[PDB]
Amino acid sequence: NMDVIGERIKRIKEEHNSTWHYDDENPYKTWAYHGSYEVKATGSASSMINGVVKLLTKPWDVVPMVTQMAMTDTTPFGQQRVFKEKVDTRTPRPLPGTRKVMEITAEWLWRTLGRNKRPRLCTREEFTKKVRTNAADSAKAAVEDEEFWKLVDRERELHKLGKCGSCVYNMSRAIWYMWLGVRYLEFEALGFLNEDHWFSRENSYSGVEGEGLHKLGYILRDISKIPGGAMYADDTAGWDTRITEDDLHNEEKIIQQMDPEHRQLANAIFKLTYQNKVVKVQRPTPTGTVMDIISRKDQRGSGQVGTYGLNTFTNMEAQLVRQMEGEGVLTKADLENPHLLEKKITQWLETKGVERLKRMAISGDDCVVKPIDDRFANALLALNDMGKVRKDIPQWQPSKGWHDWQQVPFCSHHFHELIMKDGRKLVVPCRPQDELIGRARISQGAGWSLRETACLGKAYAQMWSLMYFHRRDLRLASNAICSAVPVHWVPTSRTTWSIHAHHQWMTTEDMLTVWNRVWIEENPWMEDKTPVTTWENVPYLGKREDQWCGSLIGLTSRATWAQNIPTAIQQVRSLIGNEEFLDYMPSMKRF
Ligand SMILES: O=C(O)Cc1cc(CC(=O)O)cc(-c2ccc(C#CCO)s2)c1
Ligand SMILES: [Zn+2]
Ligand SMILES: [Zn+2]
């Protein structure tokens, strides 16, 4: 193994030979530990609070979930704890028949996915345009420096020679350039999966990439119309730690459809950075803080360019195999059998595969499957054997499915069908309200001025106006925040890193106009394009559903807060200073 990772370690060792040592009291059990070197402590024990959101959400000061979200440990102690819990484990190898089914399915799935699209190299200008339009950090400084691109070219030349010298994954500028350069080369070779939307619903059938949170509920309602059994949505315990050497070799098969110059570079990413990896992890010690250099041959690096697409691919593959077992195509004898008959697997894929892909919604490790019947609930032999063991359930206990698409969890949400005052139907995303308020109250980092804080608050408020307007507390809070923040201040910083976020709220455009564009105009499931001219005609969940999903409506603390909210808005306004504000409260029946 040292012939693939040796150069990378040698470079770290030489760069840090001042403090380099072999700490023989390292906690690594399943990862190969190479050595340590002293570093400054990174991360925080708690998170900075957004004072603007906090001052306008007083009844949530006494909410346990809200308080918990303000915590989250990112220090060396925090990193080490989570590492021990999941990351430091070994997945038993799948049986020979299981490996054969996975291989046949992976081959057919890659050909299906590549039927209209062809893989291609991503460029320096694509990465630059992304880094720019995202930041509008020190990544933009690297992208602007020609010296960064020269290091990129030098690493690429090693990659063409089947070698790696600096591509290290992380759990002054030279160390930073090497990380961003590793991510650029990964983007260059595998970015086409995201950039050319290989996992869009039109291309992949099961996929939802590029669809957006505002479309997922509509997709789940469409799946519910397909005849079959219940809708299943099983969670895998630590999916990324369950990616096997067999899964990686199956994912690699995409290189067969590439141009030779592209195949060479993607092969280097697969063989040197995915199937072999050098990882940096911070660890506290009595002496101080050290960086451990570790390695392994399996699992997925969660921060990588290809992670989402390759998890989506492998999960679509694992769900087709579970569907086959449910249908009696795959038996216990077949999974143990090295000489398993390929014919019936190939016949099922070619005649039923695509129809079976359409019964699913798959986003990385998140899946929803509507099998042809409920034998699937008890079809666990292949799922467990592939290493995709379901979270917090005995291994052989049958899965519990849902007979209502509205009860189905998917991508940290559930979805409600609403009836508007004009009789039109809307399908909206939803989650427990404490999680929404709890997140909005967290600002990211330190040294943030009241201006930047108010603008992040405005971004959260506007995200709620577009996605979660159907929650009474969030519409009130959203209007209060937008009334407290100067009208012309542009929402800055992101509210989420979610691939499902299209960030329509990142604007100073009127939110009712944006609402109309998203839910009416561009909405494929909205036949009648009549605009909604007032927020008074923008619907809410039924009062009972709003309460079931965490609303404080009907509580006295909530009525007190609503009644006294112009006072809290005025307090925020007075501290922000003499700027132009707009009273958004009259857009509600209360004012
Ligand atoms: O990032 C967090 O702390 C929560 C979170 C999680 C997830 C699920 C996931 O991607 O795993 C989605 C979101 C979004 C909020 C609004 C969105 C939109 C839209 C339409 O343009 S997507 C937020
Ligand atoms: Zn490299
Ligand atoms: Zn709900």
Backbone torsions φ then ψ of 184, nearest 5 degrees: -65, -45
Ligand minimally distant from the alpha carbon of residue 495: 1
Experimental method: X-ray
List the structure tokens of 8.
């990378």
Mention every residue, 6+ apart, whose C-beta is less than 8 A from residue 567. Answer: none
Choice from 213, 366, 427, 434 to test ligand 1 binding pocket (greatest atom count within 8 A of CB): 213
Q: Which ligand gives the minimal distance to the CA of 500?
A: 1
Residues with CB under 6 A from ligand 1: 212-214, 411-412, 439, 463, 467, 496-502, 504
Q: Rounded CA gap, 501 and 493, in Å?
A: 13
Query: Beta-carbon neighbour count of residue 135 at 10 Å?
Result: 11
HSE-up of residue 405 (Cα within 13 Å, Cβ side): 23
Closest ligand 1 atom number to CA of residue 497 = 1
Assess contact for 4 and 273: CB atoms under 8 A: no
Closest CA to 563 of 474, 480, 495: 480
Residue nearest to atom 17 of ligand 1 (CA): 501
Interval between CA 294 and ligand 1 midpoint (Å): 32
Cα atoms found within 13 Å of the Cα of residue 483, Cβ hemisphere only:
21
Tell me the CATH number for domain 1-42+76-89+165-171+275-297.
3.30.70.2840
365-379: b (≥16 Cβ within 10 Å) or e: bbbbbbbbebebbeb
CB 537, CB 424: distance < 8 Å: no
Cα–Cα distance between 403 and 411 in angstroms, integer?
19
CA–CA distances in Å: residue 316 to residues 105, 169, 290, 590: 10, 26, 39, 48
Which residues of the chain form CATH 3.30.70.2840? Answer: 1-42+76-89+165-171+275-297
Q: Enter the resolution in angstroms.
A: 2.1
Distance of CA 525 to the CA centre of its chain: 25
Ligand 1, atom 10, residue with closest C-alpha: 498
214 CA: nearest ligand 1 atom: 20
Residue of 214, 413, 498, 523 to mutate, ligand 1, most atoms within 8 A of C-beta: 498
Taking the C-alpha atoms of residue 30 and residue 41, their distance in angstroms, rounded to an integer, is 25
